[PDB]
RNA sequence: GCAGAGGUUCUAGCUACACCCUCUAUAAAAAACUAAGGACCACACGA
DNA sequence: CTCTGAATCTCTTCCTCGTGTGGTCAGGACG
DNA sequence: CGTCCGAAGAGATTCAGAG
């Protein structure tokens, strides 16, 4: 039994920090994302992708809103996506976000 | 409490437009001081929003009309 | 906020622009002082301060001080969050070619330079000198010059020209060439070239050059002089490690590169001899390319622990890559994991949830409610309250849990139903309870199985879960219309126990007022549960339009069935419950309830039926016991008889009468026959042997034995397992697959011999390893299916296209595997079908087929119904709702915007675990016979002989449905004429498989043309007949002088005049191929319809489906006629046989190359229709798409994949295969450019060319012609508009390299792309968001 | 309560996700209170 | 003599989530 | 105290028969 609301994040800022005896969260892997995609579900998938896992501003704002009692979501960008962008940049390949 | 949302799904056919309209209604309930028209009996905001959709008293068109009217009183308040 | 991303090759100027500084010291931080080094890899001056708004100097410690650099230390003061974005670079002393563009198989660096990859590797490794700006030299401008020959050139040429070495030489070459000049030069070379291979290579090169000129890319940008570094925060490993702070990490590779670069500067200022300098430059290039991609080159650098240390490319690609680890599937918060528990008391939508688990999961909600209540003034006080776990916390937890759905998710999420929401119910314990019915849908046992529990947060999320994710919302599995919450083990057994009749039982033969009285009699115990009693039932009918009418009647039934009746809703009839209610019967009952009463009554009935099944199964006490199993009395006698038979066969082998192989085959066959006999005896001892009186002397009834109840009801196991328990187990295969000679005589009930157990465990271990490989390959196939999928959503409500695929019941020569009704169910008709009464509109054009409508179609017994297909739908980037048909998730046409692609991919992938890893024609029943594509000539006896090769017998009953279809090989003779009713069980057609007939179309005499005995045809005598028969020599076997001559048969009269084909000006010549034996003599009249010469003549596993979806060409494909025409042999067995097909009107457009060893069904004189088989063999899907059309290839692939699925008894609706097929052939190739801007050589998505040609049709210019080509799922997903989805799939380095070279701009718009970006998915609710965004754009 | 400091406690507490009051250059009548940082590889096991 | 179809040589992963155990550049002395 | 050293298949790339 390993239920956790919020735990210490990794350097990739993915909050669960691996499934461990130490407090952390379970992985929502690729097949789970496929399952939500097959469902007519998009908002909950967006939460699992951004506000629950790797959006620092998103996570802080979500926690403040929930303790305020109003459940509002701010998408932002996953920190893992910025990690991917920086890693591809390190390869010498210019990847940029169009405005 | 609603075990199933079928009555809503024939109220709103797409069943994804259902999520959007009832989510806006529940948002109005939580953020605004406005309360659901159908009486609340130990029900969360989303459940009572689905209940209002079930009676047909709330739909996307009615919700848009209501918010437009509210903006109308907002403009009339400034005069 | 931000549009779709773009990717391009990064310029050195752009790299410098990104970098906040330049690093020159390899060591990152001091171990003595934790502060980062001034110029180390970990730098605050370059990458920002280690602490949020604290400087290294410590002079600045406040927010107001932020933005002011400290001159003493030299760093900027900001938040450490900036350190993640801030980036640095290294200025290499000499340029180094980027490994991705170098070592990749396309060899972009080599392709641009037009130089072989080996030469490029040599010049980069300084082994050879390449020529740059040769000018006035005998050497060409681009030439590879080895060390000794470079020295010879240097001593020979005193001119200023020199051949540079290393990466800088390649950079100079890249600068030297002009892309535009090379562009027109290569275009004119393409115009000049007459070879397909050379023009294809030059086309690849010109594609590279066109991508370079079109995008903002420079050739010299491939070789990077400045090397960017990862930010110190985005650096892996580097843990405190109890202050050891030591781990292998990309930091090691960066330190290697920086050390090399520093040493290179040290020797450049030192001006070292050129040999040491070039060796060190090669070392630096090795360090750099190892950093970029470790293991890309032959030598792979290893770090500590003797392992290949992680590199930048390795962090991107593979399972461990950032894509699949942290972008596609992200570890999430508010997730709880625990073992599963049954908890039968729960309803369908409710699941058990431990108190502590809900506490931990819902902590923010609890804190918010505590603050609202005013119990805790501060969030810290709320956390303290939760830690105290005081009483008020529990009541608060009750409020939030009450109406807040949570997602229950089994770890392997094979299909869509893997994750389903539930309304949690707080329980005392530590284990999650899952409702028993849905556990079958979850494919979850109760054996330490664990399910993740995720908590939706936003109101959109909770509402989304309640509307869609909740279990009660999705009763029907997406794969097939059959319900997925069907009773599985206990409840089905209890229902079977209730719905059974015992000939004598307590309370038999009394009449009962109603179900209430039946329940009262059973619970009182005076009347037995199962006993035939007349009862009065108030049956309700749905025939009234939106109204229920009560029918009261006395229906003979058992007490158990009458009790069960009160449970079912009113609308359902009594016929469904009157039967024994096996598992299939209960599934049909639930399906009828769903179709008639609706979703909510179906859910209530399912919960009530589960409760009743559990209760009455507990009352039954259907226990398994040793005495319950019965060994057949005939089993020992059967074993003795089989022993006698095998002994006789052994004695025959000893005497030598029978060979070893035939002996083994006979032993296996007789053992199998004995196994079937003992199985029948065992089954009879189970059900038939049960005898109990009917108030008379004796009565025989169906068994109440527990084992037979479990098997017959379908609760658990099958007949074969019951045979294994009590009957003889049967032959067990050896690991090689060969059947063991001696089967396992003893059953599982009796003692089992040691050797018998060893033989059994062979198959057991084989099955376990097969299961492991099955789940591995099934996961891979599911991933490929999803990734080729997920680019399909229902954008448009109605496509409005008349064209659609024809649907007919599938036939393999036996009983129809799938009736037409099941196939056409849920599919909108392409065209208005017609009643058997002519010119009657039985069904309108665009109407959806519901249950009553399909039943009406069965009544009229239609055979073929044209059906809208997703492939036929012409919508761009989307699939029509009407074209798709019913979603199968719920009883209506699919809702607009829903993601069909992922649904179908999961539906196909899910059964993969269940999928295993590895003459004459007799009519089954009497009916009309039909022949299609038939050319028939009657013989002397009058029996019909076919001239057409592809004639198909169709058995059509009085209703008109084609019950049976049989393939008829060419030259076969059928006694029964066409259109004549054939009695069942009699052979209509007979033929010889070994003999390939050569019939004569018209009776007449023959003249031998170009026939010489002993040269072209060798006369061979037959002793039995007494008449020597001319034998045509095989072309390759016979001599070259006889090879070129072609024997020809000409029909003539008695006078000798040649006879033409009746109705054809062309003569009736006949050609005799090699290895043909002609019994008839020259100058002998030949009857019509008689053969002239007697010419001597897959896997059902998951890999078959994988190959089909990947469209792998078979090892030996079948040659298909490209165009309709007559066949001529240009060259006979000249290396390979050459075939020419030419129409009578059009010139010969095709020459066909055929291997000599292949059998040819074609005859040269006979005309061949386009798409007809030339050489019999496995059918290649690409050939079908090229020739027979897209509808034909879709039909073939769907039929064959479904037939693979049919073998294992798993059904997937055809639309799921159809959408994947549509994705497979989404690419297209342009035959002629026409008015379109697209070049004919280039290949573009069919959507783009469709939009372009319809836009051209809008104007005067005609649309460009296009050719549709089939791509494998891996290939189709690998090559698509968006590079991000391809990179997440496979060959990530290849995909990113191709994107950067081409500079391709992603358009996003896909599910996987939006998942990776993290923005709202255009799959479910987000489709309206995306259409609003499109309106905004 | 948004830039800082002080206050009755307990070195320090200016919303740092964070808990009370004051003002724009000056320190106390006052009770509930406080901490936000850390990887990979191997083995075995469950599904 | 210049490509043909073929045989050979090279990339590229080859399920998917748990729960426990352990092992991981290592600079080293010298101005 | 800080500082420098199997297996399966796809694709490219040779490869080689045949006028
Ligand atoms: Mg299990």
Automatic annotation (TrEMBL), chain A:
<feature type="domain" description="RNA polymerase Rpb2">
    <location>
        <begin position="24"/>
        <end position="99"/>
    </location>
</feature>
<comment type="subunit">
    <text>The RNAP catalytic core consists of 2 alpha, 1 beta, 1 beta' and 1 omega subunit. When a sigma factor is associated with the core the holoenzyme is formed, which can initiate transcription.</text>
</comment>
<protein>
    <recommendedName>
        <fullName>DNA-directed RNA polymerase subunit beta</fullName>
    </recommendedName>
</protein>
<comment type="similarity">
    <text>Belongs to the RNA polymerase beta chain family.</text>
</comment>
<comment type="function">
    <text>DNA-dependent RNA polymerase catalyzes the transcription of DNA into RNA using the four ribonucleoside triphosphates as substrates.</text>
</comment>
UniProtKB/TrEMBL annotation, chain C:
<feature type="binding site">
    <location>
        <position position="799"/>
    </location>
    <ligand>
        <name>Zn(2+) 2</name>
    </ligand>
</feature>
<keyword id="KW-0240">DNA-directed RNA polymerase</keyword>
<dbReference type="Pfam" id="PF04997">
    <property type="entry name" value="RNA_pol_Rpb1_1"/>
</dbReference>
<keyword id="KW-0479">Metal-binding</keyword>
<feature type="modified residue" description="N6-acetyllysine">
    <location>
        <position position="954"/>
    </location>
</feature>
<dbReference type="GO" id="GO:0000287">
    <property type="term" value="F:magnesium ion binding"/>
</dbReference>
<keyword id="KW-0175">Coiled coil</keyword>
<feature type="binding site">
    <location>
        <position position="880"/>
    </location>
    <ligand>
        <name>Zn(2+) 2</name>
    </ligand>
</feature>
<feature type="coiled-coil region">
    <location>
        <begin position="169"/>
        <end position="203"/>
    </location>
</feature>
<dbReference type="InterPro" id="IPR007080">
    <property type="entry name" value="RNA_pol_Rpb1_1"/>
</dbReference>
<dbReference type="InterPro" id="IPR007081">
    <property type="entry name" value="RNA_pol_Rpb1_5"/>
</dbReference>
<keyword id="KW-0548">Nucleotidyltransferase</keyword>
<dbReference type="GO" id="GO:0003899">
    <property type="term" value="F:DNA-directed RNA polymerase activity"/>
</dbReference>
<keyword id="KW-0804">Transcription</keyword>
<dbReference type="GO" id="GO:0003677">
    <property type="term" value="F:DNA binding"/>
</dbReference>
<comment type="subunit">
    <text>The RNAP catalytic core consists of 2 alpha, 1 beta, 1 beta' and 1 omega subunit. When a sigma factor is associated with the core the holoenzyme is formed, which can initiate transcription.</text>
</comment>
<keyword id="KW-0346">Stress response</keyword>
<feature type="domain" description="RNA polymerase N-terminal">
    <location>
        <begin position="220"/>
        <end position="499"/>
    </location>
</feature>
<dbReference type="InterPro" id="IPR000722">
    <property type="entry name" value="RNA_pol_asu"/>
</dbReference>
<dbReference type="InterPro" id="IPR006592">
    <property type="entry name" value="RNA_pol_N"/>
</dbReference>
<comment type="similarity">
    <text>Belongs to the RNA polymerase beta' chain family.</text>
</comment>
<dbReference type="InterPro" id="IPR042102">
    <property type="entry name" value="RNA_pol_Rpb1_3_sf"/>
</dbReference>
């Amino acid at each position: 039994m390993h239920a956790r609301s919020t735990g210490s994040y990794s350097l990739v800022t993915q909050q669960p920090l691996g499934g461990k005896a130490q407090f952390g969260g379970q992985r929502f892997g690729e097949m789970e994302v496929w399952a939500l995609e097959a469902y007519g579900a998009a908002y909950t998938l967006q939460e699992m992708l951004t506000v629950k896992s790797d959006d620092v501003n998103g996570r802080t704002k979500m926690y403040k809103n929930i303790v305020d009692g109003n459940h509002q979501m701010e998408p932002g960008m996953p920190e893992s996506f910025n990690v991917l962008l920086k890693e591809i940049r390190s390869l010498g390949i210019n990847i940029e976000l169009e405005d | 409490a609603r075990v199933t949302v079928q009555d809503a799904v024939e109220k709103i056919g797409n069943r994804f437009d259902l999520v959007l309209v009832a989510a806006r209604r529940a948002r109005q309930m939580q953020v605004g001081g406005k309360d659901p028209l159908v009486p609340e009996e130990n029900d969360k905001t989303t459940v009572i929003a689905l209940r209002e959709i079930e009676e047909g008293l709330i739909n996307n068109q009615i919700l848009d009309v209501r918010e437009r009217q509210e903006q109308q009183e907002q403009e009339a308040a400034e005069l | 906020e931000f549009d779709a991303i773009k990717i391009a090759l990064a310029s050195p100027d752009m790299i410098r622009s990104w970098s906040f500084g330049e690093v020159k010291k390899p060591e990152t931080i001091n171990y003595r002082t934790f502060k980062p080094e001034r110029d180390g890899l970990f730098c605050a001056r370059i990458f920002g301060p280690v602490k949020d708004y604290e400087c290294l100097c410590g002079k600045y410690k406040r927010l107001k001080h932020r933005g002011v650099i400290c001159e003493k230390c030299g760093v900027e003061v900001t938040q450490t969050k900036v350190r993640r974005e801030r980036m640095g670079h290294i200025e290499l002393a000499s340029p180094t070619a980027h490994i991705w563009f170098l070592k990749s198989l396309p060899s972009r660096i080599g392709l641009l330079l037009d130089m072989p990859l080996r030469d490029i590797e040599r010049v980069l490794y300084f082994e050879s000198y390449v020529v740059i700006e040769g000018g006035m030299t005998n050497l060409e401008r681009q030439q590879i010059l080895t060390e000794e020959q470079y020295l010879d050139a240097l001593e020979e040429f005193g001119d200023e020209f020199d051949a540079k070495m290393g990466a800088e030489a390649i950079q100079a070459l890249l600068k030297s060439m002009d892309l535009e000049q090379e562009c027109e030069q290569l275009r004119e070379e393409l115009n000049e070239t007459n070879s397909e291979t050379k023009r294809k290579k030059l086309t690849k090169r010109i594609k590279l050059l066109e991508a370079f000129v079109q995008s903002g890319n420079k050739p010299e940008w491939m070789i990077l002089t400045v090397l960017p570094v990862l930010p110190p925060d985005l650096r892996p490993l580097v843990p405190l490690d109890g202050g050891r702070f030591a781990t292998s990490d990309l930091n090691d590779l960066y330190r290697r590169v920086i050390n090399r670069n520093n040493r290179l500067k040290r020797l450049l200022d030192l001006a070292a001899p050129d040999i040491i300098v070039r060796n060190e430059k090669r070392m630096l290039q090795e360090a750099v390319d190892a950093l970029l991609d470790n293991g890309r080159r032959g030598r792979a650098i290893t770090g500590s622990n003797k392992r290949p240390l992680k590199s930048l490319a390795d962090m991107i690609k593979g399972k461990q890559g950032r894509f699949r680890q942290n972008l596609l599937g992200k570890r999430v918060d508010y997730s709880g994991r625990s073992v599963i528990t049954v908890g039968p008391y729960l309803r369908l939508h409710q699941c058990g949830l431990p108190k502590k688990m809900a506490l931990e999961l819902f902590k923010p909600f609890i804190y918010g409610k505590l603050e609202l209540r005013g119990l805790a003034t501060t969030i810290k006080a709320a956390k303290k309250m939760v830690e105290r776990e005081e009483a008020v916390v529990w009541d608060i937890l009750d409020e939030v849990i009450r109406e807040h759905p949570v997602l229950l998710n089994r770890a392997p999420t094979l299909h869509r139903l893997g994750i389903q929401a539930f309304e949690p119910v707080l329980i005392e314990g530590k284990a999650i309870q899952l409702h028993p019915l849905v556990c079958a849908a979850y494919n979850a046992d109760f054996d330490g199985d664990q399910m993740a529990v995720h908590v939706p947060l936003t109101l959109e999320a909770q509402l989304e879960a309640r509307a869609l994710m909740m279990s009660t919302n999705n009763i029907l599995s997406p794969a097939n219309g059959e319900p997925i919450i069907v009773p599985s083990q206990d409840v089905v057994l209890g229902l079977y126990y209730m719905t059974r009749d015992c000939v004598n039982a307590k309370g038999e033969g009394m009449v009962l007022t109603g179900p209430k009285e039946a329940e009262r009699l059973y619970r009182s115990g005076l009347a037995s549960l199962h006993a035939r009693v007349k009862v009065r039932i108030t049956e309700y009918e749905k025939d009234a339009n939106g109204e229920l009418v009560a029918k009261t009647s006395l229906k003979d039934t058992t007490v158990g069935r009458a009790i069960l009746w009160m449970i079912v809703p009113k609308g359902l009839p009594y016929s469904i419950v009157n039967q024994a209610l096996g598992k299939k019967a209960i599934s049909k009952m639930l399906n009828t309830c769903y179709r008639i009463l609706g979703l909510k009554p179906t859910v209530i009935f399912a919960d009530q039926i589960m409760y009743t099944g559990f209760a009455y199964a507990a009352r039954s006490g259907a226990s398994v016991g040793i005495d319950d199993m019965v060994i057949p009395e005939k089993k020992h006698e059967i074993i003795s008889e089989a022993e006698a038979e095998v002994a006789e066969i052994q004695e025959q082998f000893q005497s030598g009468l029978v060979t070893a192989g035939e002996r083994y085959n006979k032993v296996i066959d007789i053992w199998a026959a004995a196994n079937d006999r003992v199985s029948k005896a065992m089954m009879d001892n189970l059900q038939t042997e049960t005898v109990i009186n009917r108030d008379g002397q004796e009565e025989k009834q169906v068994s109440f034995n527990s084992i037979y109840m479990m098997a017959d009801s379908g609760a658990r196991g099958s007949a074969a397992q019951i045979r294994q328990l009590a009957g003889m187990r049967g032959l067990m295969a050896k690991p090689d697959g060969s059947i063991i000679e001696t089967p396992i005589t003893a059953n599982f009930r009796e003692g089992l011999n040691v050797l018998q157990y060893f033989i059994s465990t062979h198959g057991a271990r084989k099955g376990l390893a097969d299961t492991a490989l099955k789940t591995a390959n099934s996961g891979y196939l599911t991933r490929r299916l999803v990734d080729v999928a997920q680019d399909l959503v229902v954008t448009e409500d109605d496509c409005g296209t008349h064209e659609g695929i024809m649907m007919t019941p599938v036939i393999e020569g036996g009983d129809v595997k799938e009736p037409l009704r099941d196939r056409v169910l849920g599919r909108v008709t392409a065209e208005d079908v017609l009643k058997p009464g002519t010119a009657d509109i039985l069904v309108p054009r665009n109407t959806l087929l519901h249950e009553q409508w399909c039943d009406l179609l069965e009544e009229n017994s239609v055979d073929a119904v044209k059906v809208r297909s997703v492939v036929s739908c012409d919508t761009d980037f989307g699939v029509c709702a009407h074209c798709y048909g019913r979603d199968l998730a719920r009883g209506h046409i699919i809702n607009k915007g829903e993601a069909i692609g992922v649904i179908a991919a999961q539906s196909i992938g899910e059964p993969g675990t269940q999928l295993t890893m590895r003459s004459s024609i007799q009519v089954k029943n009497k009916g009309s016979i039909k022949l299609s594509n038939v050319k028939s000539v009657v013989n002397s006896s009058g029996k019909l002989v076919i001239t057409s090769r592809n004639t198909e017998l169709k058995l059509i009953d009085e209703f008109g449905r084609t019950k049976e279809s049989y393939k008829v090989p060419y030259g076969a003779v059928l006694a029964k004429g066409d259109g004549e009713q054939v009695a069942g069980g009699e052979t209509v057609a007979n033929w010889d498989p070994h003999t390939m007939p050569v019939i004569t179309e018209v009776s007449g005499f023959v003249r031998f043309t170009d026939m010489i005995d002993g040269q072209t045809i060798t006369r061979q005598t037959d002793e039995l007949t007494g008449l020597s028969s001319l034998v045509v020599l095989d072309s390759a076997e016979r001599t070259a002088g006889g090879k070129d001559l072609r024997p020809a048969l000409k029909i003539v009269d008695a006078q000798g005049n040649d006879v033409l084909i009746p109705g054809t000006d062309m003569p009736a010549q006949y050609f005799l191929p090699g290895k043909a034996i002609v019994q008839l003599e020259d100058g002998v009249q030949i009857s019509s319809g008689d053969t002239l010469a007697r010419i001597p003549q897959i896997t059902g596993g998951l890999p078959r489906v994988a190959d089909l979806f990947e469209a792998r060409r078979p090892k030996e494909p079948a040659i298909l006629a490209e165009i309709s025409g007559i066949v001529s042999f240009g060259k006979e067995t000249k290396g390979k046989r050459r075939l020419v097909i030419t129409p009578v009107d059009g010139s010969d457009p095709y020459e066909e190359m055929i291997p000599k060893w292949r059998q040819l069904n074609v005859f040269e004189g006979e005309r061949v229709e386009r798409g007809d088989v030339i050489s019999d063999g496995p059918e290649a899907p690409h050939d079908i798409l090229r020739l027979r059309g897209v509808h034909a290839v879709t039909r073939y692939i769907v039929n064959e994949v479904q037939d693979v699925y049919r073998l294992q008894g798993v059904k997937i609706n055809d639309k799921h295969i159809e959408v994947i097929v549509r994705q497979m052939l989404r690419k297209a190739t342009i035959v002629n450019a026409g008015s379109s801007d697209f070049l004919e050589g280039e290949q573009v998505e069919y959507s783009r060319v469709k939009i372009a040609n319809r836009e051209l049709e809008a104007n005067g210019k005609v649309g460009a012609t296009y050719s549709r080509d089939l791509l494998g799922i891996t290939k189709a997903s690998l090559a698509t508009e968006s590079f991000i989805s391809a990179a997440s799939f496979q060959e990530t380095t290849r995909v990113l390299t191709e994107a950067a070279v081409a500079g391709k701009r992603d358009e996003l718009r896909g599910l996987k792309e939006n998942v990776i970006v993290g923005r709202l998915i255009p799959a479910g609710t987000g489709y309206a968001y995306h259409q609003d965004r499109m309106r905004r754009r």
